UniProtKB/Swiss-Prot annotation:
Associated clinical condition: PrP is found in high quantity in the brain of humans and animals infected with neurodegenerative diseases known as transmissible spongiform encephalopathies or prion diseases, like: Creutzfeldt-Jakob disease (CJD), fatal familial insomnia (FFI), Gerstmann-Straussler disease (GSD), Huntington disease-like type 1 (HDL1) and kuru in humans; scrapie in sheep and goat; bovine spongiform encephalopathy (BSE) in cattle; transmissible mink encephalopathy (TME); chronic wasting disease (CWD) of mule deer and elk; feline spongiform encephalopathy (FSE) in cats and exotic ungulate encephalopathy (EUE) in nyala and greater kudu. Creutzfeldt-Jakob disease: Occurs primarily as a sporadic disorder (1 per million), while 10-15% are familial. Accidental transmission of CJD to humans appears to be iatrogenic (contaminated human growth hormone (HGH), corneal transplantation, electroencephalographic electrode implantation, etc.). Epidemiologic studies have failed to implicate the ingestion of infected animal meat in the pathogenesis of CJD in human.
Free-text comment about domains: The normal, monomeric form, PRPN(C), has a mainly alpha-helical structure. Misfolding of this form produces a disease-associated, protease-resistant form, PRPN (Sc), accompanied by a large increase of the beta-sheet content and formation of amyloid fibrils. These fibrils consist of a cross-beta spine, formed by a steric zipper of superposed beta-strands. Disease mutations may favor intermolecular contacts via short beta strands, and may thereby trigger oligomerization. Contains an N-terminal region composed of octamer repeats. At low copper concentrations, the sidechains of His residues from three or four repeats contribute to the binding of a single copper ion. Alternatively, a copper ion can be bound by interaction with the sidechain and backbone amide nitrogen of a single His residue. The observed copper binding stoichiometry suggests that two repeat regions cooperate to stabilize the binding of a single copper ion. At higher copper concentrations, each octamer can bind one copper ion by interactions with the His sidechain and Gly backbone atoms.
Positions annotated with a glycan in the UniProt record: 57, 73
Result of changing residue 79 to I: In CJD; uncertain significance
Span of the entire protein shown here: 125 to 228 of 253
Disulfide-bonded cysteines: 55-90
Note: This protein is produced by a bicistronic gene which also produces the alternative prion protein/AltPrP (AC F7VJQ1) from an overlapping reading frame.
Phenotype upon changing residue 93 to R: In GSD; with neurofibrillary tangles
PTM comment: The glycosylation pattern (the amount of mono-, di- and non-glycosylated forms or glycoforms) seems to differ in normal and CJD prion.
Name the UniProt record assigns to this protein: Major prion protein
Subunit structure: Monomer and homodimer. Has a tendency to aggregate into amyloid fibrils containing a cross-beta spine, formed by a steric zipper of superposed beta-strands. Soluble oligomers may represent an intermediate stage on the path to fibril formation. Copper binding may promote oligomerization. Interacts with GRB2, APP, ERI3/PRNPIP and SYN1. Mislocalized cytosolically exposed PrP interacts with MGRN1; this interaction alters MGRN1 subcellular location and causes lysosomal enlargement. Interacts with KIAA1191. Interacts with ADGRG6.
Length: 104
């Protein structure tokens, strides 16, 4: 990362994927997932969705790196759930400054 920023914590939001199985499974298994994300400031490199990818990947793969050192093995489904959580949290932390970027 070397020069990213980090956001505040939030208590793990629910992400209504579109099925009752997943909506439950999440609350059964929410206590494993990340609750913060990593992204740069907007001054040189600024983007919309590219910046969500370079947030989400860099956070997700930070877990999928650490998993090997944590003696964990996030399932492909766990990674898929984490992706969504990381997206909405990163988009949240985008809006807060994007409204202070496109309104300056």
């Amino acid at each position: 990362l070397g020069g990213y920023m980090l956001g505040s914590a939030m208590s793990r939001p629910i992400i209504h994927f579109g099925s009752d199985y997943e909506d439950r499974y999440y609350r059964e298994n929410m206590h494993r997932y990340p609750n913060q994300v990593y992204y740069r400031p907007v001054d040189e490199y600024s983007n919309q969705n590219n910046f969500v990818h370079d947030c989400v990947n860099i956070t997700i793969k930070q877990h999928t790196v650490t998993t090997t050192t944590k003696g964990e093995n996030f399932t492909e489904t766990d990674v898929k759930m984490m992706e969504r959580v990381v997206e909405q949290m990163c988009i949240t932390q985008y809006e807060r400054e994007s409204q202070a970027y496109y309104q300056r």
